[PDB]
């Protein structure tokens, strides 16, 4: 089995499956969460590790979703 090709709520960031997150395009509000967890830039440059991390962003509805979720009270 596999996921459906909707791609309607994806997170805009410099992530690629070949090298992971681009530090030059990493959002500073999305970084709030990464740092609260204790994640290093080395984990963000691992393909397999950053593939797990990025899944959480597109899952809530991309970067604008996490940027709002931590803004709740």
């Amino acid at each position: 089995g596999s996921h459906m090709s909707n791609f309607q709520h994806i997170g805009h960031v410099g992530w690629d499956p070949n090298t992971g997150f681009d530090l030059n395009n990493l959002d500073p509000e999305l970084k709030n969460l990464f740092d609260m967890c204790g994640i290093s830039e080395a984990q963000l440059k691992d393909r397999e590790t950053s593939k797990v991390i990025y899944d959480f962003i597109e899952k809530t509805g991309g970067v604008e979703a996490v940027k709002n979720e931590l803004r709740r009270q």
């Binding site: 709030n32 969460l33 990464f34 609260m36 967890c37 204790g38 994640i39 290093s40 080395a42 984990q43 590790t49 797990v52 991390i53 899944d55 959480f56 899952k59 996490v66 979720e69 931590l70 709740r72 009270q73």
Partner: protein, 48 residues
């Protein structure tokens, strides 16, 4: 304050078994935990 969204990120990495680089040896997330401003208290209900 407000750690529930970072807790949600940790709960998501736990579905794949991933660990943070700090390995849970850190303490106290950023910003003061101050409640919403201008709070009330109860009336003079005690007897004279």
């Amino acid at each position: 304050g407000l750690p529930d969204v970072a807790q949600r990120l940790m709960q998501h990495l736990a579905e794949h078994g991933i660990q943070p680089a700090r390995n849970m040896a850190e303490h106290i997330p950023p910003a003061p935990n101050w409640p919403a401003p201008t709070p009330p208290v109860q009336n003079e209900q005690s007897r004279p």
